[PDB]
């Protein structure tokens, strides 16, 4: 009292900022639902002004949490408040299951979202998605602003519509989708997609992390030629066994030697295979080699009704569906003289992190982040902030069991659920693979235990059983990615039971995952007990340390009979555990640096594209295109060092910029180049001011960009792939001890100048020949 105001701190910025909303919490407390609804107009009026969400924060977030309790009757926990502040600084908050996190949200969103500027909500699955834009929208249309729900069932018109909402709730793969679409438009009006302003990831370990290089797809509704698969292979019934390749033993590989290589170089008119204009080339040979060399007819593979079968080796039965990937198949088409099917060709890609960075803004939400926060500021420059729980967690999480086998991990699993069973306690069983979930069920059904499988199925029909899994007598066996965000509570009479007794049938690559599994019991406060049971034979028990203890163990004299409880054991585990994830983190930041080198190409040439779509004139683009294109030409034929310059160039430039015949003997023998070039550039310009205005001005500038725009999507796309095989096959075209990455980075480089060249002469050509 008085002895407190006059002490009046060691309080954490979360722990402020919640108790200062905390204090202004009457303010609102009695306000009208018409005035506590003017605060928004209030809110955007002061931000026009000058103030910064940052200054409104603690104001936004009072009405937010009056809101809420009138809309549903929950009044934002101040563990929520800290939430909201952590996701509002551009950072992760880390708020175990059942916190609240989907409500936590709706702060920052509502803050970020006044500026006008849309904020997106990811989730994991739109039945998520319906949900809680569902739900949480009823807050937000109460505070009046828009709510927009995104899905793939809709139009290019009524998601341009939701991408115009304050708000927009949607998944990973449509954000992402759409995103490469709106880069394939051609009218700037086409597009769905605002800026990317700032997007609020839930579950985010699991599309950062885990799903982080899911790749984003859109292929081309044509097909690919097939022309080079049967000169490739035409070509390879030259070789001969020895000096023009070499077939390794043991691996199928199989590589060109020097001859061959010249002979290729020879027979296809080039100066160097490894050449990265030739890579498609290149490896059409290495397919056509392998098709003739390491694959077996009647024995890999077999042809029936004019196509290619794969053989499965030792059963003879033929795999009907499957064919071989990397052109492998079309090699083989070609070989057997079939008709070649072509795969269609990648249009657009991006992965989810790669996506993801595209944002001003990112901010997201997990039980589970902590380990990987080094990971995630690299990255995505975002922290992990740590939220208490609102009480205290009570939940038993007993340390692993240890059986020796499988058998014997999984009977004691099946014994486990039946005690609890017969108590009337529910009991949740864990797992990792749905192959396991049926081990399991088929062992409860042999008890005449009544239970419920979750395989990820269908969202909503398990969402529904899921909700249920509080009530005495539940048993349910649920597959690690199913149920995600649907908050278990305890039916009536259930905590004087023990809570929910979660029972883990593996421990997974990555702790997060574990305790995923955990954090469905003990919920706010509730009683529940957690336990894992490992086998000898389990995938991890064989990795690193692991190994060696298990050894041991063994020859110890264990049996399923009686399970080991060590804290010696289950941390020599756990130390394995770390390990692994350890080497799972290099593997992910070397696949980063590779990763980058598309990446950083695709940005550049989206942002480009983007300019053309959005430029009245290009002529001066063009023109410089040409111009680019032209000095090349020249300096083909210009060698600035039998025969001092030949000339065919004059046909080259009749049939390729200027007319058939329109020069030769104008200004163009004994020349500098520096000359040449100027001279028949004048040409071009009036051949293009005549072309203009004489046959269409407004006309040309879409004659334009229309011939620009096909021109990069089309070299794009071949860009996309043979960067793709070039990549396969760059341990090819690096040294012994060299690390490929660089030699990746380098031809990599290398290519997108050769594209970039391709598009200039396509842009050339086309604009100065044909006619619209
Ligand atoms: N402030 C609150 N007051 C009362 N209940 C809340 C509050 N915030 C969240 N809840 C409840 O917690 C449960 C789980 O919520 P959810 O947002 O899905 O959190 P999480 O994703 O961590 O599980 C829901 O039943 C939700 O209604
Ligand atoms: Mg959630």
Do not use: C
Not at 164 to 179: K, R
Not at 678 to 685: F, G, N, S, T, V
Not at 693 to 716: H, N, P, T, Y
């Amino acid at each position: 009292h008085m002895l407190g105001i006059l002490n009046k701190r060691t309080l954490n910025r979360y722990e402020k900022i919640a108790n200062d909303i905390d204090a202004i919490r009457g303010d609102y407390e009695n306000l009208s639902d018409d005035a506590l609804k003017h605060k928004t107009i209030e809110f955007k009026e002061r931000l026009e002004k000058g103030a910064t969400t940052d200054d409104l924060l603690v104001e936004a977030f009072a009405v937010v949490r009056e809101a809420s309790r009138r809309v549903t009757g929950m009044f934002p926990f101040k563990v929520q408040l800290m939430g909201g502040v952590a996701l509002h600084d551009g950072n992760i908050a880390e708020m175990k299951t059942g916190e609240g996190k989907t409500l936590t949200s709706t702060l920052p969103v509502y803050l970020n979202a006044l500026t006008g500027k849309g904020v997106h909500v990811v989730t994991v699955n739109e039945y998520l998605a319906s949900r809680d834009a569902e739900q949480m929208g009823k807050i937000f249309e109460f505070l009046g602003l828009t709510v927009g729900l995104n899905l793939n069932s809709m139009s290019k018109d009524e998601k341009r519509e939701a991408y115009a909402a304050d708000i927009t709730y949607s998944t990973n793969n449509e954000l992402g989708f759409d995103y490469l679409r709106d880069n394939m438009v051609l009218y700037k009006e086409q597009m769905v997609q605002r800026p990317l302003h700032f997007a609020v990831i839930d579950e985010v370990d699991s599309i950062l992390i885990d799903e982080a290089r899911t790749p984003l797809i859109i292929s081309g509704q044509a097909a690919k030629s097939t022309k080079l698969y049967v000169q490739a292979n035409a070509f390879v019934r030259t070789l001969k066994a020895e000096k023009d390749y070499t077939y390794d033993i043991k691996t199928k590989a199989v590589q060109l030697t020097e001859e061959g290589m010249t002979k290729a170089e020879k027979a296809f008119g080039i100066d160097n295979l490894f050449d990265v204009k030739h890579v498609a080339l290149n490896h059409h040979i290495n397919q056509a080699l392998k098709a003739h060399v390491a694959m077996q007819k009647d024995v890999d593979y077999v042809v029936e009704d004019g196509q290619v079968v794969i053989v499965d080796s030792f059963t003879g039965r033929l795999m009907k569906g499957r064919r071989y990937s990397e052109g492998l198949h079309q090699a083989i088409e070609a070989k057997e003289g079939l008709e070649i099917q072509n795969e269609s060709m990648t249009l657009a890609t991006i992965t989810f992190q790669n996506y993801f960075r595209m944002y001003e803004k990112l901010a997201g939400m997990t039980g589970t982040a902590k380990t990987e926060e080094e990971e995630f500021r690299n990255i995505y420059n975002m922290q992990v902030v740590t939220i208490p729980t609102n009480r205290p967690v009570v939940r038993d999480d007993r340390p692993d069991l240890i059986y020796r086998t499988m058998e014997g991990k999984f009977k004691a699993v099946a014994e486990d659920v039946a005690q609890r069973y017969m108590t009337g306690q529910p009991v949740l069983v864990g797992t990792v693979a749905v192959e396991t979930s049926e081990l399991i069920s088929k062992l409860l059904k042999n008890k005449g235990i009544p239970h419920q499988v979750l395989n990820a199925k269908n969202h909503e029909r398990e969402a529904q059983i899921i909700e249920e899994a509080g009530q005495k007598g539940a048993v349910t066996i649920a597959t690690n990615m199913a149920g995600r965000g649907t908050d278990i509570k305890l039916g009536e009479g259930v905590k004087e039971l023990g809570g929910l007794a979660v029972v883990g049938t593996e421990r997974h690559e990555s702790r997060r995952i574990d305790n995923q599994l955990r954090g469905r019991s003990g919920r706010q406060g509730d009683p529940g007990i957690t336990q894992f049971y490992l086998s000898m034979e389990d995938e991890l028990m064989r990795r690193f340390g692991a190994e060696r203890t298990m050894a041991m163990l063994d020859r110890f004299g264990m049996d399923d009979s009686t399970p080991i409880q060590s804290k010696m054991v289950s941390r020599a585990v756990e130390s394995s555990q770390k390990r692994v994830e350890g080497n799972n983190f290099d593997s992910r930041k070397q696949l980063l640096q590779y990763d980058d080198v598309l990446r950083q190409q695709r940005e550049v040439i989206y942002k480009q594209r983007f300019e053309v779509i959005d430029s009245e004139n290009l002529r001066e683009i063009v023109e410089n295109m040409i111009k680019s294109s032209l000095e090349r030409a020249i300096a083909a034929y210009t060698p600035r060092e039998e025969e001092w310059k030949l000339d065919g160039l004059v046909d080259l430039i009749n049939t390729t910029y200027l007319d058939e015949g329109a020069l030769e003997k104008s200004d163009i023998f004994g020349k500098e180049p520096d000359e040449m070039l100027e001279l028949i550039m004048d040409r071009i310009i009036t051949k293009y001011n005549e072309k203009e205005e004489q046959f269409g001005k407004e006309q040309m500038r879409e004659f334009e960009k229309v011939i620009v725009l096909r021109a990069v999507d089309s070299k794009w796309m071949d860009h996309i792939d043979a960067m793709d095989q070039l990549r396969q096959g760059i341990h090819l075209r690096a040294y012994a001890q060299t690390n490929p990455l660089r030699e990746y980075q380098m031809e990599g480089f290398a290519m997108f100048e050769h594209m970039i060249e391709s598009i200039e002469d396509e842009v050339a050509k086309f604009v100065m020949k044909a006619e619209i």
